[PDB]
């Protein structure tokens, strides 16, 4: 049975198993993608290419990731544009940014964007964001307009552990964010 896993409890400046792109860097502990500063883009990828399905047998992989992540906006009322976990072709590099979260370009279904993301979305884009305008978790596939959506209240500066996993049999994604309170 082909399997692959890792786990990183702490980060550090020199980290040969990650590929920083845009403003991405590791401090002495945090892996920080953007400082409180405008019009940027942070991207980290796990160095190692991952096999998720195979075309000899056709099967898809069960998988789970887990990360604790803190968003900290020096304004309470003023925060954007988002954070995102995403799976992507092997050789992907950044895309159109700010509210596109450096990961998508168009707003209509783009097939050639071979890439799926899970977003935590701290800013309303009336162009495509849920009309109600609430901050949201969402499952994106090939456009920044999410296939699904979920209102969520950001707690600023709050450690928020999250699990995301995918059933190969039922073929369902799902996400869970949690706060201590």
């Amino acid at each position: 049975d082909e399997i692959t896993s890792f786990s990183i409890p702490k980060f550090r400046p020199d980290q040969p198993n990650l590929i920083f792109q845009g403003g991405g860097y590791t401090t002495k502990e945090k892996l920080t993608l953007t400082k409180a500063v405008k019009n940027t883009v942070g991207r980290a990828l796990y160095s190692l290419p991952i096999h998720i399905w195979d075309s000899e047998t056709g099967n898809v992989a069960d998988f789970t990731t887990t990360f604790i992540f803190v968003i900290d906006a020096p304004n309470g009322y003023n925060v954007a544009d988002g954070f995102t976990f995403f799976i992507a072709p092997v050789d992907t590099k950044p895309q159109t940014g700010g509210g596109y979260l450096g990961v998508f370009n168009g707003k209509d279904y783009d097939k050639t964007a071979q890439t799926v993301a899970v977003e935590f979305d701290t800013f309303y884009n009336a162009a495509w964001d849920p009309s109600n305008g609430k901050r949201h978790i969402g499952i994106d596939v090939n456009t920044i307009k999410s296939i699904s959506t979920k209102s969520w209240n950001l707690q600023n500066g709050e450690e928020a552990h999250v699990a995301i996993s995918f059933n190969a049999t039922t073929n369902v994604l799902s996400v869970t964010l949690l706060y201590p309170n």
Binding site: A36, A61, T64, D72, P74, G82, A88, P89, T176
Partner: protein, 47 residues
């Protein structure tokens, strides 16, 4: 303890190449914030 959870089928084989990369991607624009990640696990299986 408050918690959110979303769910959805998404036919990965249909959509992504045989081999991927994962990572995070986080952006500011006009308005902004610190977006940092404290730790990371990931497992996968393939029958």
């Amino acid at each position: 303890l408050t918690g959110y959870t979303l769910s959805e089928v998404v036919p990965l084989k249909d959509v992504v190449p045989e081999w991927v990369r994962i990572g995070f991607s986080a952006t500011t624009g006009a308005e902004y914030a610190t977006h940092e990640v404290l730790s990371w696990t990931f497992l996968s299986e393939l029958t």
